Design a protein around this ligand. Structure first.
Ligand SMILES: Nc1ncnc2c1ncn2[C@@H]1O[C@H](COP(=O)(O)OP(=O)(O)O)[C@@H](O)[C@H]1O
Ligand SMILES: Nc1ncnc2c1ncn2[C@@H]1O[C@H](COP(=O)(O)OP(=O)(O)O)[C@@H](O)[C@H]1O
Ligand SMILES: Nc1ncnc2c1ncn2[C@@H]1O[C@H](COP(=O)(O)OP(=O)(O)O)[C@@H](O)[C@H]1O
Ligand SMILES: [Mg+2]
Ligand SMILES: [Mg+2]
Ligand SMILES: [Mg+2]
Lengths: 151, 316, 168, 400, 370, 370
C-alpha cells in the first residue's frame, strides 16, 4: 500500500550538515600530518612533567571531519592522557588563563571523552568539567551544544 | 494467602455440595492441579454416582513404593477400575454415603486430599522402615552404623515427580532425610528463587526455629544421592535437604509433616510469584514519592470551584 | 545521595540547564502543526549535537536537544540480575504514570532504562529549574530506592522461610 | 503449544467465571471482588477474593470491585485477584497452560497492555488470548459443537453487571464500526431497586437485598403506566420478601413497583441516567441499520442474549416486540411509498440454556479448537516485543 | 469544592472548602409555636429553624436537636441540615462532598445515622466525619499540639505529636457553654432576675457572651467585687428593663476551672489539659506544653488564655515554657481547619463515596473516618 | 579509600580509612510508629533509623537489630547498612571496599550472613571482617597487650603477643552497656521512678552516661552514700521533671565487677581479664599485665581504670607492675584501628574480593579472617 513509500526523501532533499557548517579548508592527509606533529609534543610534555604545557600545545590545533575518525580518536587518546596527568590543583590557574576558543575546545573534547568510558577515565573528565564550568560559566556548554557535529 | 492448601479446593467444595444436595445434577469436569497433576470428576452412568480419577506422570514410580496398598487402605470399598488416560480412580455413590455430616465432611476432605495421598506412600515407607531400623539400633547400638549405611542405598526412594524436580528420600535409625533436587526454568523465577533458597537455609540457622527439620543447601548434590539416575551436578539444579528427626514424624505429627514437606517447592514457587506483587506495590509507592518532587515544578494557581461531577460552581 | 555521584550529577545539571533554552517552533515539513523536533528529526538545522555525560560504562546520560525540545535518556546502575529486574519494572511503573509527570516519555529510547522529553510548553508552563532539580533528585535517589526494594525482597524471602519451616 | 487444557477466565464487573476448556460448566462463579486490609510487611498477602471476600467485611477488610463499568481500573487488585484465582482456586501453574481472558469491546489499549505484562511477567503464562467477550457468547448459542449447527451471523446483546453492549457479527467477522454500548447494566438496576426500598424507608436496603429482589421479584412489563395501574387493580402484585440482617436477625420487606420499574432501566434509560438516553430496542436497531445491507436479515434473524442481566422474566419478548415494531414501521414506510408489499424480516430474540454464562461457554468451546494455540500471544512474542504486542485493537479498524 | 458543615451543639457553622471563614453561621435550634394561632394565613409555619426561630422566639418553644455533642432528635437535625443546604448555603447537596465533624468519644450510632442521613436523605456524592480538635490543629498551622476545644455542649482535649494522635490520652468533659448558661440563669436568680423559658435562656446566653470573663485569681476578684462597685455593669433586655451584675460576670466562667459549682466531680479544663499531657509519652510532653491550642466559643472569654497559662504553669514543672495559643478567630478554628482539610489533594482519596456506602451500609464510617 | 564500620551493638561508627575519627556515629536502632497518623500531608515514613528514630522516639517503638554482638534482626540490620551507605556517608556501596568488624566467639552464621549481604545485596567490591579487640591494639600503637573491649552488647578479652593472638585464652562476657541500662532501669524503680518503654530506656541510657561512675571500693562507697547526700546528683527528664540519684549512681557500673547483680553466674571484668592472662603461656604474662588496653563505651565510666588496676593488682603477683592504658579516645578506638588497618599497604592483599567470594561462597570469610 502507498502510505509507507517515502516520497519526501527524493522530491524535497533536506539540508546537509555542510550547508550549515563551512567545509574544512584542509585535506585528510594535511590534517593527519598536522596532528601527527602535535601528538609527539603532547606525549613528550608528560615525560618532562609539564603536562599543562602539553595541553597548551596540543590544544593549538583540533582535527574535524567525518573522513578523519582515526586521527580524531588518536587526538582524543592524547587529550584524555594529557588531562589525566595534570594535577587537580593546577586546573583553576590554567582555566582562567585560557582563551574563550581554548576553553570551547577543552569542553568539547571532555565531552568526546565522556561519550566512551570503556576507553577513557570519566572521573578526571568530570573533575575538569566542574572546574571549567565554574570558572568560565554555562555559555561554554552552550557553545558545545551549538558546535559542529564532526568535532 | 501466606500458606498453600494441601487439598484440591474444587473437589472439596463440589463433594461438600453433592454430599448435601437434595437433587444431584450431572457433571463432566477435568480439573488441573500443581506439578502437572490432573483430575477428572464425572457422573458417567448415573447422576447418583460420581467417578473421581487422577492422572500423574510419576504414578508408575509411586506404585513401586507401595502406593496401591495405601490408596486401598484410605479409600476402601470406593476404589474403582482406572479410567482411560488416568492412573487411579474412585467411585462414590451419593445414596451410599455415611450417616453423619461429620463423616460426610471427612470423606469430602479425604477425596479432595487424593494428590497428597497418592504421593504419601514413599514417606510412609520411609517412616515405617525407620521404626524397624530404630528398634534394631536400640537392640545393638554398635551394629547400627552398618544398618544405616546399607539403608542409605537399599531403602532409598527417588521420585522424578516433575521434569525440573526429583525428590529423593531414605530412612536411617534416627531420621528420614529428603532431598529436593530443585530448579526454576523461568529466568525471573530463577533470579528471585536464588534469594528464596538462600534465605530459606539461613532462616534455619537462627535461634527461633531450631525445632524445625535440619536444612542444608548446595548447587554439587548430597553425597548419598550423587549416583541416583537423573541427578546431575552441572545442570543448574540446587539441592535442598531436609533431615526429619524422630520428633518431626511422631504419631501425632506424621500426616501433617508429609502434607507439608510435599508442598515445599510449591510454596516457594507461589511466593516467588507473590513477591512480584509486593515489589510492584513497593515501586508504585515511590512513584508517588517522585510525584511530589515534580509537583514542586507546577507554579501555584487556584483552580475554579467544581461540583463532584466536574460541572462549574457559582458561589463563594 | 551525592558524594560519589556529585561530579557526575554536576555535569548532568550544568548541561541539562544549558540544553533547556527552548522556544515555540512550528514544523517546516507540515503546515499549521508544531512537533517536538528532537523526537521527529526531519529537519537537521534545528537539532543541537547530542551530548553524553557518563560516570561509568553502565551509568550514562544521553542529552538530545533542539529548538523546541530536549530528550534526556539515562542508563542506571544494575550490578546484578535482581537489580536488572527491579530497575526495569520500577521504570515501567514510573513511565506508566507519564501523563502526571509531564516530562516523562512512555517508552525509553533503545539501550536506556528511562527517558524524559522536556518540550517548549513545559518550559513555559512549569518552573524549569524545578524540572532539572526533579531530574537530578531522581538520579540521586533511584539507586537507594532500588537497593531498598532488594532489602524488602530479602525480608519477604525470610518471612516465607520462617513461616514455612516453623510449621513442622 | 502445550497439550494441557487451556484455562478460561471471564472476569466480569459483577462475577468472575473460572474454569478449564471442555468442561460442562465453569469450575467457579464468584464476585469480581477483593477483600483487603485498611514487624515484616505482609498486608498484600492478607487479602481474599470472591465468595471468601464477602465473608470478611465483618473482620474489618475493605471490599472493592477492581472492575467497574466493564473496565479494570485497579491493577494492584486485579493482579492479586488473578494470583489468587490461579494458585488458590484453579490451583494451576501458568508455565504449563495457555489462558483465555476477556474484556468489553471498547476497552482501552492500556488495559490489554497492562493485562499482558501481569500474565507474562508476574505469572509467566505459556500464552494468552484476550478474547472479544460477546463474540464468544455467539458460539455458546449453538445447539451443539458440530459445524452444521453453527450460525456465524447474529446480533449479540450482552448485559452483565457493569455494561451492556450490542455486537453485530456476520460470517464470523465482527462489524466493529457498528458496536453500540449502553453504560447501564445489572448494577444500575440494583442501585435503582436499593434507591426505591430506601425511598419507602424499608427495614433493609443493603446491596445483597436489592440484588436478591432483582433475581427473584423483578420482571419486564409491556408499559409502566399500564403496570402501575395493574398494581391498583390487583392486590397480590405487591410481594413480601424475607431478609436476614448483617448482625443476624430477620426482617420483612414489602416489594412493589420496582418489580417492573427496575427492569425498565433497559427500555427507558432516562430512568437511570442523565448521560445515556436511547432505549435498548432502538439501540439494537441502530446496530443493524449501521451494519452492511446484505447482513441485516441475518442480524435480525438471530439476536442472541448473553450475560446475567438479560435473564429478567419477559425480557427477550419485550425486546423482540419493540424491535419488531421499529423494524416493521420502517418497512411499511417503504411499502407505502412503493405501492407493493415486501417479504418483511423476521426479528428473533434468542434466549438459550447457556445464556447466564455464554462468554465462558463460548471461550471453552473456542479454546477446545485444535488451532487455538496459534491465535494466542506466546511468551516468546512477549520476550521480543513486550506488552505492546497486546495493545492494537482487535475488534475495531486500526490506522497504520 | 466541598461543603464543610461544623454542625456543633449550639451553632451550625457551614460553608465551602478553601473559604476564609464560614458563610452560614446560625443557632443549632428548631422552634415550634407554644400559643393559639388565631389569625388565618399570616405566613405561619409548623416550625422555624436557626435565625428565624431566634427572631420569633417570644412565641416559640426552642429546642436544640444536639446535646453534649450527640444528636438527640434526628427529625429536627434533618430540618437543620435541610436549612444549611437549601436555605443558608443555597446548594444542591447531591452536587457537593460534605465534610462533617464530631467530638471524640461519641456513641458509634451518632456517626452511623449521620452518614446514613447524608447518603440516603440528602443524596450526597461523598462525605467524611472529622474529629473537631484534629481540624482545629490544621487551623493553627501546626502538626503537633494539644487542642482544648470547648463548644456549647462538650469540652475535649486531643494531644497530637507530629500528626499522630494519642487516643488513650484524649479527654472529654460534658461541660461547656450551655452548662455555663444554665449556671448563669441559676445565679442571676440570686440578684433578683428569673430567666426560665427556652426563649429567656437565649437572653442569658447573650448576657454571658458580652458581660462574662475569666478572673486571673478568682478569690481576689471575688473579694474586689464584694468590696467595690468597679466590677459591676449592666445589660438591657428586649423589654427595655436593665439588669445589673457583678461577681456573676466571673463566677459563671469559673465553672470551667471549678466544675463543682454545677455539682460535677471532674478536674477543670486546665487540669484536664495537664492530665492529657501527662497521659502522653515523656518525650512528647515538652512540645505539647509549648502548643496548648484553644478553640470553640467557650474559649472566647476575656482573660481565659492568661488564666489557662497561669494554671498550667502551676501544674507543669517550672523548667519549661508553657504557651497557650488563642487566635482571635478561634471561634471558628474547627470550621477553618475543615476548610483546609477538605481542600487538600490526599484528602480527595479519603472521602467515603456514594458507591462505597451503597456497597457497605453505614458501618463504612467506622473503618474509614479513623 | 576503604570504608570502615564498627557495627557495634548500640552505635554504628562508620567512615573512611586514613581519617582520624568516624564520619558517622549514630544509634544502631530502627524505630516504627506505634500510633495512627490522623493528619494528612505529614512526612509519615514506614520506619526511621539512627538519629531520626532517636529524635522521633516519643511516637516510635525502638528496636536494636544487634543483641550481644549477634545480628538478631537481619531486615533492621540491612536498613541500618543502607542508611550508613546512602544517607550517612552518602556513597554507593559498590565503589569502596568495606572493613566490617565483629566480637570474638560469635556464631559462624553471623559472619557468613554479613559477608553474603555485603557481596550480593550491597554488591561491595571487596570486604573484610576484623576482630574488634585486634583493631584496639592498632589504635593504641601496640603489637603486644590484652584488650578489654566493652561496648553496648558484649565484653571481651583478647590477649596478643608480638602480633600473635592466643585464641584459647580469649574470653567473652555477654554483659556490657545494655545490661547496665536494664539494671539502672530496675534500680531506678526502688527510688520510685518508672522507666518502661523503649524510649524511656534511651533516657535511662543518657542518665547512665551522664551520672554513673565506678566506685574504687564499693563497700566504703555504699557506707558513704548511706551517711550523707554528698554523692547524690540530679538529672532533668525531657518532661522538665528532676530525678535525684545516689548509691544507684555507682551500684549500676559495679555489675561489671559483680555480674550476680543481674543474676548471672560469671567472673567480673577484672577476674575474666586475669583468667585470660592466666590461660596464656607463662613468659608472655609479664608483658600482658603491663599492656591492659581498655576500649569501647562501657569502659568510659569515671574511676574504671583505677578500679581495674586495683583489682588486677590484687589478683596478680605483687612482684611485677600492672599498667592499664585507657586513652580518652577509647570510645572510638576499634574504628580508629580499623581505619589504620584498612590504610596499611601490607593489608591490601588481605581483603576478600567479589571475584574470590563467588568461586568459594560466604564460607571464604572463615579462611581469610581470624
Ligand atoms: N435471574 C436474573 N434476573 C436478573 N438479573 C440477574 C439474574 N441472575 C443474575 N442477574 C444479574 O446479572 C448480573 C451478573 O451477570 P454477569 O453476566 O455475570 O455480569 P458480569 O459478567 O458483567 O460480571 C448481576 O447484576 C446479577 O444480579
Ligand atoms: N464571646 C463569647 N464569650 C463567651 N461565650 C461565648 C462567646 N462567643 C460564643 N460563646 C459561647 O460558645 C458556645 C458556642 O460555641 P461553638 O464553638 O460555636 O459551639 P458549638 O460548636 O458546639 O456549637 C455558646 O455557648 C456561646 O454562648
Ligand atoms: N560515657 C559513657 N559512660 C558510660 N557508658 C557509656 C558511655 N558512652 C557510651 N556508653 C555505653 O556504651 C555504648 C556504646 O559504646 P560502643 O563502644 O560504641 O558500643 P558498641 O560498639 O557495641 O556499639 C552506649 O550505648 C552505652 O551503653
Ligand atoms: Mg460481564
Ligand atoms: Mg462545637
Ligand atoms: Mg563496638
Amino acid at each position: 500500500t502507498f502510505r509507507t513509500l517515502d516520497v519526501d526523501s527524493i522530491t524535497e532533499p533536506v539540508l546537509t550538515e555542510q550547508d550549515i557548517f563551512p567545509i574544512r579548508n584542509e585535506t585528510a592527509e594535511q590534517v593527519q600530518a598536522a596532528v601527527s606533529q602535535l601528538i609527539p609534543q603532547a606525549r613528550s610534555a608528560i615525560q618532562t612533567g609539564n603536562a599543562l604545557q602539553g595541553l597548551k600545545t596540543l590544544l593549538s590545533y583540533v582535527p574535524y571531519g567525518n573522513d578523519v575518525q582515526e586521527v580524531r580518536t588518536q587526538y582524543l587518546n592524547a587529550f584524555v592522557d594529557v588531562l589525566s596527568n595534570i594535577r587537580a590543583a593546577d586546573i583553576p590557574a590554567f582555566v582562567k588563563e585560557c582563551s574563550t576558543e581554548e576553553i570551547d575546545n577543552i569542553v568539547n573534547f571532555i565531552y568526546r571523552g565522556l561519550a566512551n568510558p570503556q576507553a577513557y577515565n570519566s572521573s578526571v573528565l568530570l573533575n575538569w568539567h566542574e572546574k571549567v564550568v565554574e570558572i568560565s560559566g554555562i555559555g561554554c556548554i552552550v557553545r558545545v551544544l551549538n558546535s559542529r557535529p564532526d568535532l | 494467602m501466606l500458606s498453600l492448601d494441601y487439598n484440591n479446593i474444587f473437589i472439596y467444595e463440589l463433594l461438600t455440595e453433592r454430599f448435601s444436595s437434595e437433587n444431584p445434577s450431572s457433571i463432566d469436569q477435568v480439573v488441573t492441579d500443581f506439578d502437572g497433576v490432573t483430575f477428572h470428576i464425572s457422573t458417567p452412568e448415573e447422576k447418583t454416582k460420581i467417578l473421581i480419577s487422577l492422572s500423574m506422570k510419576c504414578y508408575p514410580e509411586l506404585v513401586n513404593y507401595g502406593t496401591l496398598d495405601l490408596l486401598k487402605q484410605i479409600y476402601g470399598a470406593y476404589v474403582h477400575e482406572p479410567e482411560m488416560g488416568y492412573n487411579f480412580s474412585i467411585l462414590i455413590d451419593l445414596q451410599q454415603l455415611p450417616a453423619t455430616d461429620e463423616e460426610k465432611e471427612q470423606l469430602a476432605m479425604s477425596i479432595s486430599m487424593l494428590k497428597r495421598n497418592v504421593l504419601a506412600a514413599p514417606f510412609h515407607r520411609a517412616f515405617t522402615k525407620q521404626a524397624e531400623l530404630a528398634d534394631l539400633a536400640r537392640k545393638d547400638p554398635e551394629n547400627a552404623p552398618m544398618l544405616d549405611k546399607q539403608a542409605t542405598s537399599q531403602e532409598l526412594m527417588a521420585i522424578h515427580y516433575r521434569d525440573e524436580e526429583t525428590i529423593v528420600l531414605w530412612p536411617e535409625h534416627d531420621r528420614v532425610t529428603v532431598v529436593f533436587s530443585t530448579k526454576f526454568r523461568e529466568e525471573t523465577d530463577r533470579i528471585f528463587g536464588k534469594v528464596f533458597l538462600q534465605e530459606f537455609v539461613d532462616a534455619r540457622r537462627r535461634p527461633a526455629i531450631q525445632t524445625a527439620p535440619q536444612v542444608l543447601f548446595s548447587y554439587d548434590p548430597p553425597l548419598e544421592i550423587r549416583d541416583i539416575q537423573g541427578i546431575q551436578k552441572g545442570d543448574d539444579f540446587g539441592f535442598v535437604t531436609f533431615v526429619l528427626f524422630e520428633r518431626h514424624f511422631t504419631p501425632q505429627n506424621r500426616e501433617d509433616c508429609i502434607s507439608h514437606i510435599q508442598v515445599f517447592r510449591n510454596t516457594l514457587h507461589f511466593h516467588i510469584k507473590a513477591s512480584k506483587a509486593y515489589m510492584h506495590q513497593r515501586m508504585r509507592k515511590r512513584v508517588a514519592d517522585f510525584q511530589k518532587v515534580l509537583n514542586r515544578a507546577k507554579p501555584d494557581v487556584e483552580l475554579e470551584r467544581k461540583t463532584a461531577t466536574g460541572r462549574s460552581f457559582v458561589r463563594a | 545521595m551525592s558524594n560519589t555521584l556529585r561530579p557526575y550529577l554536576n555535569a548532568v545539571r550544568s548541561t541539562l540547564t544549558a540544553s533547556l533554552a527552548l522556544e515555540e517552533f512550528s514544523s517546516e515539513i507540515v503546515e499549521r502543526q508544531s512537533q517536538p523536533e528532537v523526537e521527529v528529526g526531519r529537519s537537521p538545522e534545528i537539532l543541537l549535537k547530542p551530548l553524553v555525560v557518563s560516570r561509568n560504562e553502565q551509568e550514562q546520560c544521553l542529552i538530545e536537544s533542539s529548538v523546541n525540545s530536549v530528550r534526556f535518556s539515562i542508563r542506571i546502575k544494575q550490578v546484578d540480575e535482581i537489580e536488572r529486574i527491579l530497575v526495569r519494572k520500577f521504570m515501567q511503573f514510573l513511565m506508566g504514570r507519564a501523563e502526571s509527570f509531564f516530562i516523562l516519555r512512555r517508552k525509553p529510547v533503545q539501550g536506556y532504562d528511562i527517558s524524559f522529553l522536556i518540550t517548549n510548553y513545559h518550559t513555559e508552563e512549569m518552573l524549569k529549574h524545578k524540572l532539572v532539580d526533579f531530574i537530578i533528585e531522581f538520579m540521586e535517589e533511584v539507586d537507594a530506592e532500588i537497593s531498598e526494594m532488594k532489602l524488602f525482597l530479602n525480608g519477604r524471602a525470610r518471612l516465607v522461610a520462617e513461616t514455612y519451616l516453623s510449621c513442622f | 503449544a502445550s497439550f494441557n487444557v487451556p484455562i478460561i477466565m471471564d472476569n466480569g464487573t459483577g462475577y468472575s467465571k473460572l474454569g478449564y476448556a471442555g468442561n460442562d460448566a465453569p469450575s467457579y462463579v464468584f464476585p469480581t471482588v477483593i477483600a483487603t486490609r485498611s514487624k515484616r510487611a505482609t498486608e498484600d498477602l492478607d487479602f481474599f477474593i470472591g465468595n471468601d471476600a464477602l465473608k470478611k467485611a465483618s473482620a474489618g477488610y475493605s471490599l472493592d470491585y477492581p472492575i467497574r463499568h466493564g473496565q479494570i481500573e485497579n491493577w494492584d487488585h486485579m493482579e492479586r485477584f488473578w494470583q489468587q484465582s490461579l494458585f488458590k482456586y484453579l490451583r494451576c501453574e501458568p508455565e504449563d497452560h495457555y489462558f483465555l481472558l476477556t474484556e468489553p469491546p471498547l476497552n482501552p489499549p492500556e488495559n490489554r497492555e497492562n493485562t499482558a505484562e501481569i500474565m507474562f511477567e508476574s505469572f509467566n503464562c505459556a500464552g494468552l488470548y484476550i478474547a472479544v467477550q460477546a463474540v464468544l457468547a455467539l458460539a455458546a448459542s449453538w445447539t451443539s459443537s458440530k459445524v452444521t449447527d453453527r450460525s456465524l451471523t447474529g446480533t449479540v446483546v450482552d448485559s452483565g453487571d457493569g455494561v451492556t453492549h450490542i455486537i453485530p457479527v456476520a460470517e464470523g467477522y465482527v462489524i466493529g464500526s457498528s458496536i453500540k454500548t449502553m453504560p447501564l447494566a445489572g448494577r444500575d438496576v440494583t442501585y435503582f431497586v436499593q434507591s426505591l426500598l430506601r425511598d419507602r424507608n424499608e427495614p433493609d436496603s443493603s446491596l445483597k437485598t436489592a440484588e436478591r429482589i432483582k433475581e427473584e421479584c423483578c420482571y419486564v412489563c409491556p408499559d409502566i403506566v399500564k403496570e402501575f395501574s395493574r398494581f391498583d387493580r390487583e392486590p397480590d402484585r405487591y410481594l413480601k420478601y424475607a431478609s436476614e440482617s448483617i448482625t443476624g436477625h430477620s426482617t420483612t420487606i414489602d416489594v412493589g413497583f420496582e418489580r417492573f420499574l427496575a427492569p425498565e432501566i433497559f427500555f427507558n434509560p432516562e430512568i437511570a441516567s442523565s448521560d445515556f438516553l436511547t432505549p435498548l430496542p432502538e439501540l439494537v436497531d441502530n446496530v443493524v441499520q449501521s451494519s452492511p445491507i446484505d447482513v441485516r436479515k441475518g442480524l435480525y434473524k438471530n439476536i442472541v442474549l448473553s450475560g446475567g442481566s438479560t435473564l429478567f422474566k419477559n425480557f427477550g419478548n419485550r425486546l423482540q416486540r419493540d424491535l419488531k415494531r421499529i423494524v416493521d414501521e420502517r418497512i411499511h414506510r417503504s411499502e407505502m411509498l412503493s405501492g407493493a408489499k415486501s417479504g418483511g424480516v423476521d426479528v428473533n430474540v434468542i434466549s438459550h440454556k447457556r445464556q447466564r454464562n455464554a462468554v465462558w461457554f463460548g471461550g471453552s468451546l473456542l479454546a477446545q479448537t485444535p488451532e487455538f494455540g496459534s491465535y494466542c500471544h506466546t511468551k516468546a512474542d512477549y520476550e521480543e516485543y513486550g506488552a505492546s504486542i497486546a495493545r492494537r485493537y482487535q475488534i475495531f479498524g486500526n490506522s497504520l | 469544592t466541598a461543603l464543610v458543615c461544623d454542625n456543633g451543639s449550639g451553632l451550625v457553622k457551614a460553608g465551602f472548602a478553601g473559604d476564609d471563614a464560614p458563610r452560614a453561621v446560625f443557632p443549632s435550634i428548631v422552634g415550634r409555636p407554644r400559643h393559639q394561632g388565631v389569625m388565618v394565613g399570616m405566613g405561619q409555619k409548623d416550625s422555624y429553624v436557626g435565625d428565624e426561630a431566634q427572631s420569633k422566639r417570644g412565641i416559640l418553644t426552642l429546642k436544640y436537636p444536639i446535646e453534649h455533642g450527640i444528636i438527640t432528635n434526628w427529625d429536627d437535625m434533618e430540618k437543620i441540615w435541610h436549612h444549611t443546604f437549601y436555605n443558608e448555603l443555597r446548594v444542591a447537596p447531591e452536587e457537593h462532598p460534605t465534610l462533617l465533624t464530631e467530638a471524640p468519644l461519641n456513641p458509634k450510632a451518632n456517626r452511623e445515622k449521620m452518614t446514613q442521613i447524608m447518603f440516603e436523605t440528602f443524596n450526597v456524592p461523598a462525605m467524611y466525619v472529622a474529629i473537631q480538635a484534629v481540624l482545629s490543629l490544621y487551623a493553627s498551622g501546626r502538626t503537633t499540639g494539644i487542642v482544648l476545644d470547648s463548644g456549647d455542649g462538650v469540652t475535649h482535649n486531643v494531644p497530637i505529636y507530629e500528626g499522630y494522635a494519642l487516643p488513650h490520652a484524649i479527654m472529654r468533659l460534658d461541660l461547656a457553654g450551655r452548662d455555663l448558661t444554665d449556671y448563669l440563669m441559676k445565679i442571676l436568680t440570686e440578684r433578683g432576675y428569673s430567666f426560665v423559658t427556652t426563649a429567656e435562656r437565649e437572653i442569658v446566653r447573650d448576657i454571658k457572651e458580652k458581660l462574662c470573663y475569666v478572673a486571673l485569681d478568682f478569690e481576689n476578684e471575688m473579694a474586689t467585687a464584694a468590696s467595690s462597685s468597679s466590677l459591676e455593669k449592666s445589660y438591657e433586655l428586649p423589654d427595655g428593663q436593665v439588669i445589673t451584675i457583678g461577681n456573676e460576670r466571673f463566677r459563671c466562667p469559673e465553672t470551667l476551672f471549678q466544675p463543682s459549682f454545677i455539682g460535677m466531680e471532674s478536674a477543670g479544663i486546665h487540669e484536664t489539659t495537664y492530665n492529657s499531657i501527662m497521659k502522653c509519652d515523656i518525650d512528647i510532653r515538652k512540645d505539647l506544653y509549648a502548643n496548648n491550642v484553644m478553640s470553640g466559643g467557650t474559649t472566647m472569654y476575656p482573660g481565659i488564655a492568661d488564666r489557662m497559662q497561669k494554671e498550667i504553669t502551676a501544674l507543669a514543672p517550672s523548667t519549661m515554657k508553657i504557651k497557650i495559643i488563642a487566635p482571635p478567630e478561634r471561634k471558628y478554628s474547627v470550621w477553618i481547619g475543615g476548610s483546609i482539610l477538605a481542600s487538600l489533594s490526599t484528602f480527595q482519596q479519603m472521602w467515603i463515596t456514594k458507591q462505597e456506602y451503597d456497597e457497605a451500609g453505614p458501618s463504612i464510617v467506622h473503618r474509614k473516618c479513623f
